[PDB]
Amino acid sequence: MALNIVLYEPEIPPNTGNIIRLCANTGFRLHIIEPMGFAWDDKRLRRAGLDYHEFTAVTRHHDYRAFLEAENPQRLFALTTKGTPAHSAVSYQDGDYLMFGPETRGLPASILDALPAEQKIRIPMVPDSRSMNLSNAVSVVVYEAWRQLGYPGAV
Amino acid sequence: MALNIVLYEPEIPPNTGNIIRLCANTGFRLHIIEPMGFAWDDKRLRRAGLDYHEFTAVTRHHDYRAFLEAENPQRLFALTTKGTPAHSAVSYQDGDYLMFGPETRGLPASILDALPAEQKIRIPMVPDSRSMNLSNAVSVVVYEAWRQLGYPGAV
């Protein structure tokens, strides 16, 4: 199984820590587009108690263009409140990359405009909802994609 | 829609803060079984930036028996690594209560033994996985239940 999570300029250490654990638990690979809002050395990152092996799921990319050149994503989805289909209304498949913006801002227009409407997904919410925690949102999208594929690799 | 999340003796403030936001975003109601590992006044709880209205989704119960007497749950599910069906392999319905143990321990045997095997659910994971963050786990179960019901109340 090849499913990928992409974090664009993540800002808050414990969110990234949680998402690393999430990838380790699901077999998803993690891609980080620099710069991050914190150092890898940050004490808040590994409060998670992350093992050495868990970091082998993580690849760093200097910028978005470098990410595209290294990974050549076959399909790139972006989570955005501006999206149209629900995260569960699309059909994920091997090779997909699922991209998320920073905790305090959306993904840049220059990226969002490169994607067709059907690849910009949104997590359903009640009217007048507030922002969801980023690691929560990634967990929801990841587990929904993994569900659709029948949880390959799970015990 | 009447779906309920139950936290048994939650320990870590930001997890509960995130789960409160989660309930506000989904229309789920939150039930807390005391005692908590932190005070409501805890600075770490509202780093979340929780609005006053969001706290109206929360009811506190002095202990598990008091919870049962006040709520009279029609069906009670428990998330446990010991569970048998996946969280997505059961069929949620109006009136369900979804119960979660503390971040650093399972739910007590005296509660788990009261539940049939089919009501003890587990989130799928790869072999040799480590513990999932509690707010991540609740988000996954909540969004899966809400998906099954067709996201009633979502914009």
Domains with residue ranges and CATH for chain A: 1-155 (3.40.1280.10)
How far apart are alpha carbons A14 and B33 in whole angstroms?
26
How far apart are alpha carbons A120 and B101 in whole angstroms?
35
How far apart are alpha carbons B26 and A130 in whole angstroms?
11
Residues constituting chain B? 155
What lies within 8 Å, CB to CB, of A99 at 6+ separation is A5, A6, A7, A8, A76, A77, A78, A79, A107, A111
Q: Within 13 A of A116's CA, how many CA atoms are on the CB side?
A: 5
Q: Is the dihedral of CA A20, A22, A23, A28 positive or negative?
A: negative
Q: Does B18 touch chain A (CB under 8 A)?
A: yes
Contact indicator for B75, B46 with CB cutoff of 8 Å: no
Contact indicator for B64, B85 with CB cutoff of 8 Å: no
DSSP-derived secondary structure letter, A57:
G
Tokens representing residue B113 in the block:
């033994």
Tokens representing residue A83 in the block:
């999206």
Q: How far is B65 from chain A (nearest CA, A)?
A: 30
Question: Does the distance separating the beta carbons of B144 and A139 come in below 8 Å?
Answer: no
The answer to whether B107 is annotated as binding is no
In 3D space, the residue among B92, B77, B103, B100 whose CA is nearest the CA of residue B143 turns out to be: B92
Which residue has 């108690």 as its token pair? Answer: A49
C-alpha triplet B98, B19, B76: angle, nearest 5° = 5
How far apart are alpha carbons A26 and B39 in whole angstroms?
34
Q: Which residues in chain B touch residue A22, judged by CB atoms under 8 angstroms apart?
A: 132-133, 136
How far apart are alpha carbons B135 and B140 in whole angstroms?
9
What lies within 8 Å, CB to CB, of A62 at 6+ separation is A34
What lies within 8 Å, CB to CB, of B75 at 6+ separation is B93, B95, B96, B97, B119
The answer to whether B123 is annotated as binding is yes
How far apart are alpha carbons A10 and B76 in whole angstroms?
37
Q: Does A46 touch chain B (CB under 8 A)?
A: no
Indicate the Cα dihedral angle A3, A36, A131, A112, nearest 10°: -60
Q: Which residues in chain A touch residue B154, judged by CB atoms under 8 angstroms apart?
A: 124-126
How far apart are alpha carbons B47 and A30 in whole angstroms?
26
Closest partner residue to B125 among A25, A88, A127, by Cβ?
A: A25
Q: Which residues in chain B touch residue A129, judged by CB atoms under 8 angstroms apart?
A: 24-25
Question: Does the distance separating the beta carbons of A126 and B153 come in below 8 Å?
Answer: yes
How far apart are alpha carbons B5 and A54 in whole angstroms?
30
One-character DSSP codes across A7-43: EES---HHHHHHHHHHHHHHT-EEEEESPPSS-TT-G
Strand partners, A100: A7
Resolution of the PDB structure in angstroms: 2.0
Contact indicator for B141, B21 with CB cutoff of 8 Å: no
Nearest residue of A to residue B126, measured between CA atoms: A154
The answer to whether B33 is annotated as binding is no
One-character DSSP codes across A90-132: S---TTEEEEE--TTSPPPHHHHTTS-GGGEEB----TTPPPP
How far apart are alpha carbons B23 and A38 in whole angstroms?
29
Residue type, B39: A
Residue B22 sits at φ, ψ, to 5 deg, of -55, -50
Taking residue A70's Cβ as centre, other Cβ atoms within 10 Å add up to 12
Q: Does A123 touch chain B (CB under 8 A)?
A: yes
Nearest residue of A to residue B49, measured between CA atoms: A130
How far apart are alpha carbons B122 and B112 in whole angstroms?
13
Contact indicator for A78, A115 with CB cutoff of 8 Å: yes
One-character DSSP codes across chain B: ---EEEEES---HHHHHHHHHHHHHHT-EEEEESPPSS-TT-GGGSTT---GGGGGGEEEESSHHHHHHHH--SEEEEE-TT--SBTTSS---TTEEEEE--TTSPPPHHHHTTS-GGGEEB----TTPPPPPHHHHHHHHHHHHHHHTT-TT--
Contact indicator for B87, B121 with CB cutoff of 8 Å: yes
The answer to whether B101 is annotated as binding is yes
Q: Which residues in chain B touch residue A127, judged by CB atoms under 8 angstroms apart?
A: 155
In 3D space, the residue among A117, A23, A31 whose CA is nearest the CA of residue A67 turns out to be: A31
CA distances from A5 to B2, B66, B95 (A): 33, 42, 34
